[PDB]
């Protein structure tokens, strides 16, 4: 909602809410280490699965994508929503251990359900400082040794390669600039 007007297609508040929830729950999992014991990494659509939430914002001068006001595209809302969620959801998780443990159990069960349906596979050597494994110099490989938890970005050149390599996630994402 934005000034008591429902948004069908979400908006910037919805994106900030989702990002804050994912970051906070991943941080809690990493801090407590329950994901390590479960041997599965929670991602998006596991925290959000089986969730009910009601986001309401009061912008003075909102900017929508159309006169129907089905999507808020105000850039100021996302930072405020993300900051407030990142503080207060973490505070709530630290305050409520039992509810946090129950939600973490639900998220771990969802992650295990996701992991079960994946295709059978085997670990693969990845490019590293000590060992290259006979891979090209242009490749900027990732840390994750398991396929199905890694990505390869085929970009158009070396400049785009550097731009993508500077901003990425080293755990999962790898880049192979073509010519």
């Amino acid at each position: 909602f934005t000034n008591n007007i429902p948004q069908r297609d979400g908006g910037t508040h919805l994106a900030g809410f989702r990002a804050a929830m994912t970051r906070t729950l991943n941080a809690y999992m990493d801090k407590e280490g329950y994901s390590k014991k479960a041997k599965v990494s929670a991602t998006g659509d596991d925290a959000r699965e089986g969730l009910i939430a009601v986001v309401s914002v009061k912008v003075p001068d909102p900017k929508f994508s159309s006169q129907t006001k089905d999507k808020l595209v105000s850039s100021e809302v996302k930072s405020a929503v993300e900051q407030q969620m990142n503080e207060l959801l973490a505070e709530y998780l630290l305050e409520n251990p039992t509810d946090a443990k129950i939600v973490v159990g639900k998220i771990i069960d969802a992650a295990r359900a996701r992991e079960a349906a994946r295709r059978a596979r085997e670990m693969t050597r990845r490019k590293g400082a000590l060992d290259l494994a006979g891979l090209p110099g242009k490749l900027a490989d990732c840390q994750e040794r398991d396929p199905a938890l890694s990505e390869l970005y085929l970009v158009e050149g070396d400049s785009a390669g550097g731009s993508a390599k500077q901003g990425r996630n080293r755990k999962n994402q790898a880049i192979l600039p073509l010519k």
Binding site: A15, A19, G44, E156, S159, G162, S163, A164, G167, R168
Partner: protein, 89 residues
């Protein structure tokens, strides 16, 4: 305003006062933070899975568009241009 054209043109002219567009001629012109916000971050990500609906139609399309012969390619391009010209009759 005396006509709808005048009103629409005035609104468009008033819209483009503070506007400033930045065309990206490839990912080199994008900052890494902008790339992360737009494409790389799985939360704000929008991909498309490449899937094959019909194998025969896909093979025919690949041969026509990307094969050696130009006559099927030129005919396909001309027919699609005319179709784009005659979207609504």
């Amino acid at each position: 305003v005396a006509s709808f054209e005048q009103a629409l043109d005035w609104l468009v002219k008033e819209s483009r006062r503070g506007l400033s567009i930045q065309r990206y001629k490839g990912l080199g012109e994008m900052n890494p933070e902008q790339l992360w916000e737009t494409t790389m971050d799985p939360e704000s990500r929008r991909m498309l899975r490449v899937t094959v609906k019909d194998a025969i139609a896909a093979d025919q399309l690949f041969t026509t568009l990307m094969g050696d012969a130009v006559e099927p390619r030129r005919a396909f391009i001309e027919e699609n241009a005319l179709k784009a010209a005659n979207i609504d009759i």
